Amino acid sequence: GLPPGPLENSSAKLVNDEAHPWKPLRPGDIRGPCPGLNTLASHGYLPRNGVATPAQIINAVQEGFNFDNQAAIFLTYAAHLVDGNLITDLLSIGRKTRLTGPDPPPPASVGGLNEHGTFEGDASMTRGDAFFGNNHDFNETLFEQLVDYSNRFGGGKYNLTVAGELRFKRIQDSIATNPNFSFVDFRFFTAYGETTFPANLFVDGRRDDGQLDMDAARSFFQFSRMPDDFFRAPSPRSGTGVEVVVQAHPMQPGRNVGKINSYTVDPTSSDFSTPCLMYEKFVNITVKSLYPNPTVQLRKALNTNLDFLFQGVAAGCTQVFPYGR
Ligand code: HEM
Ligand SMILES: *[C@@H]1O[C@H](CO)[C@@H](O)[C@H](O)[C@H]1NC(C)=O
Ligand SMILES: *[C@@H]1O[C@H](CO)[C@@H](O)[C@H](O)[C@H]1NC(C)=O
Ligand SMILES: *[C@@H]1O[C@H](CO)[C@@H](O)[C@H](O)[C@H]1NC(C)=O
Ligand SMILES: *[C@@H]1O[C@H](CO)[C@@H](O)[C@H](O)[C@H]1NC(C)=O
Ligand SMILES: CCCCCCCCCCCC(=O)O
């Protein structure tokens, strides 16, 4: 189905309402590394089992949180291309599931958002690095570090100053302890934007002050649960203020090279100076690696989802076509 268009009405409104109550997980219900999608599934903005179409995810992030249309399109189709089933049009917001339908041939994993190295990656704020054995569950120690950073840099609240310090701390902990730490291309970009999302989207829209309290923070990050009477943001947004996060501790894209404390800059990586390159490498290297010589139906589905992806790409970039036209 087509990418949904922006909200007709983007006002702050109650999204924790009678039609979208929080429910606990049933057996089979999938939650993953994204507290946003997790919250939308747990309020029934997405199917509660955590398996959804791209169109469902786009409508959910807009309606539930006032995520802006362009960000919603780019992030949803990028995740779907690398983690979703392109024939069934279904994506797991967590673990690999037979509910996404019959798999394509390898090396495509259709591993859901839990799949490491595709969308999900290292130096997450409240989830551990995949090397430490779990890239998706809420982590109490990490969240207590977010609370500590909120006390030290945010006067008890999560804000872009806290994002700046914590983003860097998580990178330096991954450099120190994960010999397989990877911080290049797609992850380098998403890792910065994600640290703004709590300040931009988890703050009650009647305040919209970019100061997230630790009760609300815990309710989203741990329980996938809106605060009682939660109002979504009063206007569409996603990553606004990411510039403050980068400016706090500017980092070059790089990786550990099989050892802790071996962070090596990758000159082949995109950075914030080459945003078009990040899109080109994502489509030409990542997507094409998972589907090197696709069958005619898969090729059609790929081309359709790549067109959709390109709608989410900022103007100034040229569309790349790994399967032709
Ligand atoms: C647009 C569709 C979305 C997709 C496909 C998506 C996907 C993801 C994925 C796969 C991650 C895990 C990356 C990682 O940390 O390793 C992530 C992280 C995150 N997402 Fe989403 N997301 C979406 C929208 C949103 C929205 C609307 C919000 C907030 C309302 C949000 C908030 C977050 C936050 C805070 C994290 C970081 C969690 C952490 O580091 O502990 N995302 N997202
Ligand atoms: C838009 O939504 C707001 C909040 O729910 C509501 O009060 C208002 O009547 C709506 N206005 C339009 C233009 O539909
Ligand atoms: C959570 O994170 C900490 C440190 O980052 C780690 O030591 C721990 O093994 C993780 N998992 C649990 C179950 O706390
Ligand atoms: C975060 O909170 C601290 C303490 O209240 C404040 O000094 C800082 O200006 C805030 N930053 C932002 C971006 O709101
Ligand atoms: C991707 O492939 C296209 C040709 O299909 C090429 O124009 C483009 O420069 C490549 N982008 C990079 C280097 O990833
Ligand atoms: C999922 C993380 C991405 C969220 C926001 C990314 C920031 C927008 C892209 C670059 C911004 C800029 O260079 O002006």
Ligand SMILES: [Cl-]
């Ligand atoms: Cl929008």
Ligand SMILES: [Mg+2]
């Ligand atoms: Mg991660």
